[PDB]
Design a binder for this molecule. Structure first.
Ligand SMILES: Nc1ncnc2c1ncn2[C@@H]1O[C@H](COP(=O)(O)OP(=O)(O)O)[C@@H](O)[C@H]1O
Ligand SMILES: Nc1ncnc2c1ncn2[C@@H]1O[C@H](COP(=O)(O)OP(=O)(O)O)[C@@H](O)[C@H]1O
Ligand SMILES: Nc1ncnc2c1ncn2[C@@H]1O[C@H](COP(=O)(O)OP(=O)(O)O)[C@@H](O)[C@H]1O
Lengths: 472, 481, 509
């Protein structure tokens, strides 16, 4: 049952072969809750596309490992794996054993880890400059929200530069996302601290209280119990009563309404104020710690900002604007993709050119190694190089250009020693261009973990030859 | 593209039939006749000849093979396999969305490189040495009944083509149909067979009054009113006093009354090709009619005239001590089955001498010639600027099927030896490290007699690629007349 | 006869299924549970014990490998391969007209002859570090992906060597197997001490203690019932708080009793104290004991308390009113290990624990279960190697030498039973035929070279998986246990005797 598992994994490649690259197609996703969505991120397709074939579930579980130590290259796991098994049939139909292919890819997986550092063209200067981030971040945002790479490359650059001085503390949790219904990308901006969309329900515009609480004459004494405990900021989960709204304004207690539960639990882990279920009990232990709680009006919309003036501050929140909730979700993923791009660059910085440049340069070397390396494993090392070529083919098809002219021209420039050459991103131009001058640079550490996972997944599939049901 | 793909499966299935019918360990096949009978042959030439096929693309494979049988009596099995394997790479036709013209230019470009690569591993031959030619012709004598008289078949096959070759004209043309007429004579055994150094006519003896044995013959090539011309056309021939009257058309019954009166041999139904060999043998001349004969139409220089009944059958021996651009084989045998074995097996060996004498160049067979070629095109593809390099590499991977079948028919591990066979051509010289057809392991061809001529492989790869070009140039089937 | 043909072909199909997972170079099988669990493994016991088969005849063969795994711990895949080939060759004679009763008599003679052949070729090599590594290489190579061989080999060897002294027999309960996530697979190593799931969680605790006296307790330090003749009676929420002041006197006063023991037994600097109470602990008791350099642990397993008694030496206590210095232990480095998310307690460098910990690390759940069985299957392979002082060569080298002894053997009981020995000869040679295919080489060409190897000496010849030539299993470090092959030939003959003697198959409900 090997040919059936391979053919089943090729069914999954076509669901993400076209969604890859800047000219990639979108996919008409329909949620399980009877909702319509349109996107091109491969991570979101598999979350809704229930992959029931067990043979391809290993590839999806490999993409789950793509979350740890990296936040990019998911399409590499889906395309590179599908091309290895697709060409694996050409070896098995000749008569080659499945075991010699398994040990052949482990040889090429190590060989590529030794050739990849030689192709590192440049590295991040780590000067914490906005022009440094936005210039290098031009690669990761595109193919996720294409055309709007100008504003996004500069916004996230402002959020990451604020955290690098706090060395050893940069993570994706520091840069949160907060989107508001608005006109479009022109009104989007970046602010410090925690920023939410719901404005202050009460009359307080600014209060420097420390304790924050999260949840006719009787209710007037209960709101006073929040003040008796030394807290002038009350956060109600659901709706607030009309009588309780005014009682908070008498003692200058800032009323805040947070309907989304993600807004409530976000405060539990930052200032320490946890949500109590009872109707405002006088519990001081479960209250938080904040330096200043004030109201800000940015983008013609009032927003509650929790700025930690006394502390150093490491909590960033990008204020996004967009008229469509479906479109703002596509921007939500590109923001998380850009934040995770530099989260890997906190380690040793190494950058490789994208756009199929390294994939031909890496295949040109392994192919030459397979010609001079005798043994029964060379057939698998050769196709491991030709499997890299499918990633240029993914971009050539999405760009509307014949992939045959792409692989010929990428091989010709590298044959003459012209490295750092990738695909020209244009439909009317089947030629190529230099990736170094264009500013297209991927992450070295992402490819090291991506080629490692895609080979282990393809080996994990080839090791299986039959599926048998069971019962505990 | 449905018509482009139809010619793939139409030829891929035909190659599957004769895929295991290659080499000295060729596998037999079972053909069910409509009358319940079974033929258990193994030659791919006769197998596909009787199998009726429905697709037109597969029918062209049969018309191509028959023309190959006239040029060279062997190697036609690989002609269809390479043309079928070259077209079996559907990744570059449809999946890559390439045009057929893209791949045709790639194969035509690879054709000129394969021709030069086979000449690099060539080797000259000293045709003067009969022992060096014995190693070449023995490739066909092995696994035959003629192995008991291999030295006799070598003398019959090698010396016969030397008589047909005329090296004074420059072109050195060799024709087996006109100048190498093979005939049988009853009686005797395979040992009694020899090559007649002249012409032999298969005309039976009708009248008893005919010159039986003459050491210096004389050959003449060419109621009331009815017998007027008959007696006069016959009386003009005896002016020269001949001993055998050789006529082109048939002779009447009354004209033979004067041929038996003269007690001379009467021969008729002789082709125009047959009389020229005689005119060049005994120096005679072909006259249009019997009435305008001259002195030059004589048999001066002839060996002898013998119409003896050998094996209960007359045979007119008009041989001489010269080689007038022609020859005649005398096959002797006790039965027709034994005669049928030597007659057909010598035609396989006689055609090998035709390829060496026209161009004394050999190639290392037994899977050695393919790997020597496929290794040259693979390295050349890495430096070939253009999209044609991808189908250029498919030819390097497709020609490996010839040694794949020889090792698979033997039953050994084809995947283990073929992968290591690449290393022998990668490091060491490509002219050696072949594959043993009987044993299955690797061995050098300089020590073995698996060397094939040059003309056999040239027509193979030319026709193997030309067949794929003609089939990929098709894109639709037209019905009508 | 038809009652056998349904059982004969039932094993032949079962032979073609499990033959592709013998050895390291073979393939793996998937287990689809239907609920969401997926598993990969080559061990035939899991492919038969947890798997559901369609045929009832093949279901009986599953119970054989279940008991086979309980005795020897390995070799269950080849047990079914010989069984499937025994009935295959028996069917060749049954077609001629031989009753199955005589064929069982032939297996009985060859089984006793082959068992005598093991006594001649077995090697009683001294057990040490270098030899057991060669044995553990044979058991773990077929349970991993050709990378965890050298990693896990040193673990299982040194694990058993740590718990074997004074000629004491081996016990599998002396090893605590733990698992850790959020890490790679090659980080599996040995832990001298015992690893606890839950540990101390307070900022005022020490990060590591070079030396601490471990006090064993079983006392409840959370809200419990009233220990005197009283109960919980209140009228409001404020009155209920007054009962908290009364009930907590049973918990709070017991925290100070530990402090009095701390200043009593080594209360000076350069010392420590670790409480390993099994019950839960209140944060007020954690803050009270954390300031005193006393590490308080809670939420431990029942078996961990048994091993904790051996690690430090302190006897298990049930009440702090019965507290005494006699139940105090002692250990070396006591610290807390940090993972990506969680943290665990480590009490390594004990005095005389007599209990080691094989700490497994892997990133995934389905991959951690594959190594879970390889540990139990690797530890038991070397367990029989030391308990059984004699070993045999691996690489299928026993099968090819056994074929030479049985062909050169005539039955001294009757003639017609000689053919049963001929079938048992070709049935044992299926193992070099299976491994030749899993390696990707020709099936018969590998069998010729190992069989053609002969000499005027004692020559052990086996199968080379990397090249396909005759391999001397003793020269390359390829060895098995003596009880494995002894239980193989002793088991496979009984099952073939029970099934072949079935004359008819009646549907009994
Ligand atoms: N501007 C671009 N030009 C060429 N290739 C790109 C571009 N942007 C992204 N890609 C490629 O598409 C694949 C997916 O990119 P990305 O969206 O950054 O990662 P993921 O799809 O895993 O989130 C990557 O291998 C990347 O090289
Ligand atoms: N003794 C031999 N050893 C190895 N290969 C051989 C031997 N004899 C023939 N072959 C191979 O068998 C192939 C077919 O030979 P032949 O039978 O003459 O042609 P066909 O199969 O077309 O009739 C040749 O290409 C040759 O390489
Ligand atoms: N690489 C190898 N080459 C030759 N024989 C091997 C190899 N690996 C294991 N074997 C043999 O295969 C048999 C079964 O090994 P193992 O996989 O541990 O048991 P099981 O197959 O029952 O799980 C052993 O008796 C051993 O001799």
């Amino acid at each position: 049952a090997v040919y059936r598992n391979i053919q089943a994994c090729k069914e999954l490649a076509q669901t993400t072969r076209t969604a890859y690259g800047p000219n990639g197609m979108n996919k008409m996703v329909i949620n399980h809750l009877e909702k319509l969505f349109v996107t091109n991120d491969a991570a979101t397709i598999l979350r809704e596309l229930e992959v029931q074939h067990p043979a391809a579930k290993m590839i999806v579980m490999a993409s789950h490992m793509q979350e740890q130590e990296v936040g990019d290259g998911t399409n590499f796991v889906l395309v590179f794996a599908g091309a290895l098994l697709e060409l694996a049939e050409e070896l098995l139909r000749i008569g080659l054993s499945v075991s010699e292919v398994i040990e052949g890819y482990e040889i090429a997986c190590r060989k590529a880890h030794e050739i990849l550092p030689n192709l590192v063209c440049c590295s991040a200067k780590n000067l914490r400059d906005i022009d440094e981030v936005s210039s290098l971040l031009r690669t990761s945002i595109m193919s996720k929200q294409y055309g709007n790479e100008v504003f996004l490359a500069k916004l996230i650059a402002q959020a990451c530069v604020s955290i690098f001085p706090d060395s050893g503390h940069f993570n994706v949790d520091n840069i949160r996302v907060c989107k508001i219904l608005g006109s479009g990308i022109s009104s989007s901006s970046v602010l410090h601290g925690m920023v939410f969309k719901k404005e202050t329900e009460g009359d307080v515009t600014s209060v420097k209280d420390a304790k924050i609480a999260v949840y006719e004459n009787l209710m007037d004494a209960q709101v006073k119990a929040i003040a008796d405990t030394g807290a002038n900021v009350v956060v109600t989960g659901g709706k607030v009563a009309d009588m309780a709204l005014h009682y908070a304004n008498k003692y200058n207690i800032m009323l805040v309404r947070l309907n989304s539960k993600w807004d409530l639990r976000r405060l539990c882990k930052t200032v320490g104020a946890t949500a109590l279920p009872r109707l405002t009990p006088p519990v001081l232990e479960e209250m938080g710690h904040c330096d200043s709680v004030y109201l800000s009006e940015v983008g013609d919309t009032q927003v509650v900002v929790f700025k930690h003036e006394k502390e150093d501050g490491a909590i960033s929140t990008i204020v996004l604007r967009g008229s469509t909730d479906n479109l703002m979700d596509d921007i939500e993923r590109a923001v998380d993709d850009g934040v995770n791009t530099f989260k890997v660059l906190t380690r040793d910085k190494r950058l490789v050119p994208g756009g199929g440049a390294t994939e031909i340069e890496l295949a040109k070397q392994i192919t030459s190694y397979g010609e001079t390396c005798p043994g029964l494993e060379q057939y698998a090392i050769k196709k491991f190089a030709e499997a890299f070529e499918a990633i240029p083919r993914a971009l050539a098809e999405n760009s509307g250009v014949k992939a045959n002219e792409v692989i010929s021209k990428l091989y010709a420039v590298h044959q003459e020693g012209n490295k750092n050459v990738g695909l020209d991103i244009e439909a009317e131009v089947p030629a190529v261009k230099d990736m170094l001058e264009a500013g297209i640079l991927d992450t070295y550490l992402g490819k090291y973990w991506a080629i490692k996972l895609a080979t282990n997944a393809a080996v994990t599939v080839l090791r299986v030859d039959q599926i048998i049901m069971a019962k505990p | 593209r449905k018509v482009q793909s139809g010619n793939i499966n139409a030829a891929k299935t035909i190659a599957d039939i004769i895929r295991t019918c290659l080499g000295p360990k060729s596998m037999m096949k079972m053909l069910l006749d409509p009358m319940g009978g079974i033929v258990m042959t193994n030659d791919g030439n006769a197998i596909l000849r009787e199998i009726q096929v429905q697709h037109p693309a597969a029918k062209s494979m049969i018309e191509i093979s028959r023309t190959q049988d006239e040029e060279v009596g062997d190697g036609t099995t690989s002609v269809i396999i390479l043309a079928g394997e070259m077209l079996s790479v559907a990744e570059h036709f449809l999946e890559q969305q390439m045009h057929p013209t893209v791949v045709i230019s790639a194969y035509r470009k690879a054709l000129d490189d394969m021709i030069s690569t086979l000449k690099k591993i060539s080797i000259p031959v000293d045709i003067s040495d009969s022992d060096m030619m014995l190693n070449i012709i023995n490739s066909s004598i092995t696994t035959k009944a003629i192995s008991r008289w291999s030295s006799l078949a070598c003398n019959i096959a090698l010396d016969a083509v030397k008589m047909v070759q005329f090296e004074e004209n420059g072109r050195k043309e060799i024709d087996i149909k006109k100048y190498a007429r093979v005939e049988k004579i009853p009686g005797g055994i395979i040992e009694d067979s020899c090559v007649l150094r002249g012409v032999m006519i298969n005309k039976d003896v009708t009248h008893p009054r005919m010159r039986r044995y003459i050491k210096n013959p004389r050959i003449v090539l060419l109621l009331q009113m009815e017998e007027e011309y008959i007696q006069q056309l016959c009386e003009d021939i005896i002016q020269l006093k001949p001993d055998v009257v050789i006529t082109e058309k048939g002779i009447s019954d009354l004209a033979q009354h004067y041929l038996m009166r003269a007690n001379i041999t009467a021969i008729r139904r002789v082709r125009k090709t047959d009389n020229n060999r005689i005119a060049r043998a005994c120096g005679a001349r072909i006259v249009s009619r019997p009435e305008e004969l001259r002195e030059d139409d004589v048999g001066t220089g002839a060996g002898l005239l013998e119409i003896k009944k050998i094996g209960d059958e007359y045979f007119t021996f008009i041989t001489d001590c010269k080689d007038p651009k022609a020859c005649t084989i005398l096959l002797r045998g006790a039965s027709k089955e034994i005669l049928s074995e030597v007659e057909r097996n010598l035609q396989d060996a006689m055609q090998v001498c035709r390829n060496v004498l026209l161009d004394p160049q050999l190639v290392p067979g037994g899977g050695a010639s393919e790997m020597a070629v496929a290794h040259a095109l693979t390295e050349k593809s890495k430096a070939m600027t253009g999209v044609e390099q991808w189908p250029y590499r498919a030819v390097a991977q497709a020609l490996e099927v010839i040694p794949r079948t020889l090792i698979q028919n033997c039953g050994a591990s084809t995947i283990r030896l073929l992968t290591s066979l690449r290393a022998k051509h990668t490091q060491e010289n490509c002219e050696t490290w072949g594959v043993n057809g009987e044993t299955g392991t690797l061995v050098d061809m300089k020590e073995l007699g698996i060397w094939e001529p040059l003309a056999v492989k040239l027509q193979t790869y030319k026709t193997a690629v030309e067949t794929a070009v003609l089939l990929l140039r098709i894109d639709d089937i037209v019905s009508g007349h | 006869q038809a009652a056998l043909a349904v059982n004969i072909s039932a094993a032949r199909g079962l032979q073609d299924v499990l033959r592709t997972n013998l050895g390291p170079k073979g393939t793996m099988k998937m287990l689809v549970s239907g609920a969401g669990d997926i598993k990969l493994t080559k061990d035939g016991n899991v492919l038969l014990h947890e798997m559901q088969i369609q045929h009832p005849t093949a279901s009986l063969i599953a119970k054989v490998a279940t008991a086979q795994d309980d005795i020897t711990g390995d070799g269950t895949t080849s047990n079914v391969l010989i069984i499937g080939e025994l009935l295959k060759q028996a069917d060749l004679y049954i077609s001629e007209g031989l009753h199955p009763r005589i064929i069982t008599e032939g297996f009985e003679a060859a089984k006793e002859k082959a068992l005598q052949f093991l006594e001649e070729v077995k090697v009683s090599r001294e057990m040490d570090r270098e030899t057991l590594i060669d044995v553990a290489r044979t058991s773990l190579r077929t349970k991993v992906h050709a990378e965890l061989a050298d990693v896990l080999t040193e673990a299982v060897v040194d694990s058993i060597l740590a718990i074997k002294k004074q000629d004491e027999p081996i016990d599998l309960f002396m090893i605590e197997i733990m698992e850790m996530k959020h890490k790679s697979e090659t980080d599996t190593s040995l832990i001298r001490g015992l690893v606890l799931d839950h540990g101390a969680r307070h900022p005022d605790m020490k990060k590591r203690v070079e030396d601490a006296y471990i006090l064993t307790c079983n006392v409840s330090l959370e809200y419990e019932k009233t220990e005197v003749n009283s109960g919980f009676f209140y009228k409001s929420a404020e009155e209920r708080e007054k009962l908290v002041k009364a009930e907590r006197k049973f918990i709070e006063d017991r925290v100070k009793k530990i402090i009095e023991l701390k200043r009593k037994v080594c209360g000076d600097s350069d010392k420590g104290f670790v409480v390993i109470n099994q019950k839960g602990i209140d944060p007020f008791s954690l803050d009270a004991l954390s300031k005193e350099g006393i590490v308080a642990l809670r939420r431990a397993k029942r078996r961990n308390m048994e091993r904790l008694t051996l690690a430090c030496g302190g006897v298990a206590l049930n009440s702090f009113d019965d507290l005494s210095p006699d139940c105090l232990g002692h250990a070396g480095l006591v610290y807390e290990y940090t993972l990506g998310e969680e943290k665990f307690t480590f009490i390594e460098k004990c005095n005389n624990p007599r209990s080691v910990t094989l700490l497994i690390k892997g990133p995934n759940k389905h991959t951690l279960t594959q190594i879970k069985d390889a540990v139990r299957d690797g530890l038991r392979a070397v367990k029989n190697a030391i308990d059984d002082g004699c070993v045999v060569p691996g690489a299928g080298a026993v099968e090819v030498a056994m074929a030479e002894a049985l062909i050169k053997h005539k039955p001294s009981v009757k003639g017609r039973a000689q053919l049963g020995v001929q079938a048992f000869a070709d049935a044992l040679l299926i193992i070099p035929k299976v491994l030749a295919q899993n390696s990707g080489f020709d099936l018969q060409e590998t069998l010729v070279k190992i069989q053609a190897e002969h000499s005027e000496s004692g020559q052990l010849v086996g199968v080379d998986l990397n090249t396909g030539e005759p391999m001397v299993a003793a020269e390359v470090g390829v060895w098995d246990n003596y009880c494995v092959k002894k239980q193989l030939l002793h088991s496979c003959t009984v099952i073939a005797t029970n099934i072949l003697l079935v004359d008819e198959i009646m549907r009994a409900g």
